[PDB]
Symmetry: D2
Subunit: 260 residues, 4 copies
Amino acid sequence: MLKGKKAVVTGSTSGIGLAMATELAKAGADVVINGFGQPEDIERERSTLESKFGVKAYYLNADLSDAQATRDFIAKAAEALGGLDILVNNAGIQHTAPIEEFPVDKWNAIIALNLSAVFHGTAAALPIMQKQGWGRIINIASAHGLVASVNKSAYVAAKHGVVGLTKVTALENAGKGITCNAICPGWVRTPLVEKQIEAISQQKGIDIEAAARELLAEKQPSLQFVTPEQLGGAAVFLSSAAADQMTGTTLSLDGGWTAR
Amino acid sequence: MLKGKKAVVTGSTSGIGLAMATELAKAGADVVINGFGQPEDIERERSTLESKFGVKAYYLNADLSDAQATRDFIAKAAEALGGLDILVNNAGIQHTAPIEEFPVDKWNAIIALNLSAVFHGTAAALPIMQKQGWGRIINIASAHGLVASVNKSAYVAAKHGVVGLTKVTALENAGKGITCNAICPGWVRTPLVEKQIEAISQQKGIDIEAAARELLAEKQPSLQFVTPEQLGGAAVFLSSAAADQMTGTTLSLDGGWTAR
Amino acid sequence: MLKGKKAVVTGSTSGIGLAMATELAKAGADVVINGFGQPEDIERERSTLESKFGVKAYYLNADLSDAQATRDFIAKAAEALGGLDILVNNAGIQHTAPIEEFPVDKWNAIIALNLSAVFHGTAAALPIMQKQGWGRIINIASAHGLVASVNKSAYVAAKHGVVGLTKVTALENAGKGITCNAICPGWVRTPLVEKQIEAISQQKGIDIEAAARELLAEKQPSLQFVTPEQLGGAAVFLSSAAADQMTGTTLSLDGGWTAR
Amino acid sequence: MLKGKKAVVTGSTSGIGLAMATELAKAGADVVINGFGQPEDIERERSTLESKFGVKAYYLNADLSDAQATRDFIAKAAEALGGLDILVNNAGIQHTAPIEEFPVDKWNAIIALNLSAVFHGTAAALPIMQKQGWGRIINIASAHGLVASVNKSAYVAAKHGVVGLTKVTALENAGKGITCNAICPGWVRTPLVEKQIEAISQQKGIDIEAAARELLAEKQPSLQFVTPEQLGGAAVFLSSAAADQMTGTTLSLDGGWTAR
Ligand SMILES: NC(=O)c1ccc[n+]([C@@H]2O[C@H](COP(=O)([O-])OP(=O)(O)OC[C@H]3O[C@@H](n4cnc5c(N)ncnc54)[C@H](O)[C@@H]3O)[C@@H](O)[C@H]2O)c1
Ligand SMILES: NC(=O)c1ccc[n+]([C@@H]2O[C@H](COP(=O)([O-])OP(=O)(O)OC[C@H]3O[C@@H](n4cnc5c(N)ncnc54)[C@H](O)[C@@H]3O)[C@@H](O)[C@H]2O)c1
Ligand SMILES: NC(=O)c1ccc[n+]([C@@H]2O[C@H](COP(=O)([O-])OP(=O)(O)OC[C@H]3O[C@@H](n4cnc5c(N)ncnc54)[C@H](O)[C@@H]3O)[C@@H](O)[C@H]2O)c1
Ligand SMILES: NC(=O)c1ccc[n+]([C@@H]2O[C@H](COP(=O)([O-])OP(=O)(O)OC[C@H]3O[C@@H](n4cnc5c(N)ncnc54)[C@H](O)[C@@H]3O)[C@@H](O)[C@H]2O)c1
Ligand SMILES: CC(C(=O)O)C(=O)O
Ligand SMILES: CC(C(=O)O)C(=O)O
Ligand SMILES: CC(C(=O)O)C(=O)O
Ligand SMILES: CC(C(=O)O)C(=O)O
Ligand SMILES: [Cl-]
Ligand SMILES: [Cl-]
Ligand SMILES: [Cl-]
Ligand SMILES: [Cl-]
Ligand code: NA
Ligand code: NA
Ligand code: NA
Ligand code: NA
Ligand code: NA
Ligand code: NA
Ligand code: NA
Ligand code: NA
Ligand code: NA
Ligand code: NA
């Protein structure tokens, strides 16, 4: 249980981040959500976190590709919550192309969100955690923070960068009651992945589900998707006392991807 | 909760394994314990698992440096439990010396217990898990399955071997409902480590607790020990549904050791 | 021997890059050098590469923190050389501060040079190498592309990012006659490190050489610096036929840093 | 050049080890060879090392699955050579089967040769290298010392163990003029691999060369074999001055295997 804890989840209007916010709320944490989407859906998300799980929930819109907006977001989040115990740096994007064709603006956008926002969010959060002598920073990296695939230069670079940044954060705050770890998922069937399944299905002239199977077969030995719920469970474990001395490391939920 | 689950923990008469057995019993699992020690203490351990936590508990004595004894142990364990859902391959020993002075019999003993017993125990357990379509194999490796220190050739070799074996086990059983992962602790203050703290204290002419601090400072950035209870919590997480697609990987609870 | 080969070394007016350019020239390669410094020193460097080693050498000034300048540099380099066989992405900077004090502009500057320039330089070079069916891209990462230290968030993030980018580059160009690998040095006594030795010497109130010894003792088990000449040798090996099937990997010359 | 150096290569009657011995002899080293095979072929190998390359060469038969035989081999080798500068621990075997079907005797045989012989050979060599203040220990691990595949439990465990042992050796002898590193090949078309290509060809009902292509496609992005000659080149680089501060690490020549 995380009763009383104050959590922030970036990019929690969709996908993995939405499940993170849900699982933390179900554990008893008040939650700040963030991200893009339809305003009606976002407000329904916010209000149902409160009405289902009896916590406080706030939505703060911030484009975390902007450094100052990210730092201002963390301040506003901590003000809303009355503190900041758990930060989940989750927001991210993907774009696929070979390096020589990879758009410079897409490189910049992926580095800005998937890497730099993790730095800026961490930097803003840390003094709050340091003052109280407790904190969790949970970075959502990827299997692609540990290994590579073709046509994902920016994303692999960014995610490797997140794994490095995680280690530094941990070392700088070792023994302070603050841990920092990176959750490294394999394939999870969110909109980020559905776009790649569709692109495969076209390339190969197959139906969407045959394409999903081929995507899994190439990388993920279990031949099953990792679920957002599972990953929310992992974040809840990282937030627990059992994980007091788990810091600076990666937690891979990837169906065997990185074992081979 | 692991209500109804059937667990086996090797080397669970002391240290980390004793906490593993305790946490699994507290989660509702029936438990087979194993290891050396005073018979009066072992029977008190067994009986109090039952009387505290309302599960069944059995003690089976087996020297797991012997391959056939290890395989016979798993059979006897599964017969006692009426099945075998969770295997924790935990028993291990340590000996410190530079390579050219390292006793050949100690190399053999460390390889036999710390590596080969994990293979033989896994081999015996797997068909039971494969038939039922569910299982957890949880190998207790070390930070020394990922990095080295001086004067620990056999142990580092064995533990690296366990990390490799974990990956194979996972891959071979991917998608079958069976996962295999390695918990990689840093320093935990058990008798295995107390011997090294004492040897330091002599070498340096300091008291035992100053020696414990020096041991931590050299390797473990948090400057705190990992606890057996924490590691029992990690095993309980690995046994959970959230960890259905966590397989073939390492879970480091090491206070930052492997981050630097 | 690399007789006839056409090489480019970024940040080759100082330190490791200067030794890279020297060793490649000594092996018979024509060389484009790059970087900041005193014009008189740079021209002496250029002209003495030619007069000592009988190759052609060119200096192209480009601030590689600018993406378009980096891409324009590679074009100008290939035009000067009449081709482009070997690219050494070496230019880099360092800044030390804890995350919450780490200047946003320094984060941006380190990401731009130490990571993004590697992407932009690679992207520009690749089509030239792909057309000829041979190439070497040699990225100078660090031990800090594999592990972390305190107060080096941006640099560790960038260098981990370079290690990831290296892997992608390799995979995308597997079998094409092009390899991409990352050289990961430990401490090398260049101006980048002399600044840190000086900062230590002040912090600890010791002389510069006692500070150098303390810097080595903390991280580098050999207690010796890696030399620029050694690293130039490593680049010459990577450029050789023996390394035709060495791709996507790290070559650590670090006195044991990453072994522990 | 390694003129005057004294080298020992285990398992150098076939495959990678034969190329190791050849390249070291071509660099000017006297060489002790070792392994099984036809006596006429072995003597022709020995004598042609001498007649082609003008060095001394000796063949010492030792079954390195036996610890004392391994230690006695190193003594006899050093006596033949008049010293011992470079030790290449290369001899190894393979067997494929799922864990629950994996023969206990094959586990024991693979651990004994592929792991324990590396320990015993290292232990015997080290005092000779320590006394002279120079040495190279070059362990032939595998991609399977870093990652796993199915049906290779013993081999993956052993090779991970070699990677760990390499790190310890390096750390214990840091700064002494002795380095220890592990060469980690991908597929190399020796008899060890030809057996697996044949087993595939049967399983799939295809010709041998289509099977070789399928073997490469599954693991090795370059779609080319690594050659024994290349690996001999890598050993010659490790033996060079440029590699004085390369210690405790892995040198992967694997066509991209471990990048993904
Ligand atoms: N889906 C996978 O298979 C997978 C695997 C490994 C890691 N990841 C990582 O998981 C994280 C979540 O990804 P997902 O699959 O749930 O994707 P998703 O597209 O479902 O969700 C992305 C979330 O980030 C938000 N977002 C995007 N741009 C933003 C910006 N500039 N500022 C603030 N918010 C922004 C979106 O609105 C959304 O809430 C990402 O970091 C991704 O890299 C995903
Ligand atoms: N303590 C640490 O800091 C630490 C760190 C990393 C990993 N580990 C690993 O944790 C595991 C448990 O170690 P611990 O610190 O609790 O040590 P411990 O000495 O307290 O416990 C060892 C257990 O194994 C049993 N045992 C020993 N030899 C055996 C044999 N031949 N057959 C069956 N049982 C045997 C002992 O009786 C005891 O129950 C080991 O695998 C060890 O390598 C320990
Ligand atoms: N010295 C070490 O111990 C060490 C260890 C690991 C990795 N590295 C890496 O080695 C590489 C070289 O570092 P060094 O120690 O030789 O440092 P150095 O300061 O001696 O040399 C840096 C070189 O890069 C050039 N440079 C800097 N900013 C630039 C810009 N914007 N555009 C173009 N050129 C620029 C400099 O003019 C100089 O030629 C760097 O990538 C560094 O991260 C160094
Ligand atoms: N071929 C590959 O693709 C590949 C890939 C990675 C690593 N490796 C490793 O390379 C090394 C050499 O393998 P290879 O492919 O050249 O195989 P190989 O079968 O051609 O050669 C094996 C050598 O070891 C010798 N040998 C076997 N048993 C021995 C014993 N008990 N005592 C002494 N010598 C013994 C053999 O006689 C032979 O000289 C092995 O360690 C292997 O694990 C091979
Ligand atoms: C697996 C998935 C991710 O890493 O986000 C991908 O897009 O590669
Ligand atoms: C840390 C501890 C262990 O790995 O068991 C040790 O003995 O090194
Ligand atoms: C070792 C050195 C480097 O990585 O450049 C440092 O500044 O940490
Ligand atoms: C690649 C090869 C080896 O590792 O020896 C194999 O048998 O898997
Ligand atoms: Cl890929
Ligand atoms: Cl050490
Ligand atoms: Cl540090
Ligand atoms: Cl596999
Ligand atoms: Na709180
Ligand atoms: Na940003
Ligand atoms: Na059960
Ligand atoms: Na055994
Ligand atoms: Na390390
Ligand atoms: Na050329
Ligand atoms: Na740039
Ligand atoms: Na000699
Ligand atoms: Na042996
Ligand atoms: Na991999």
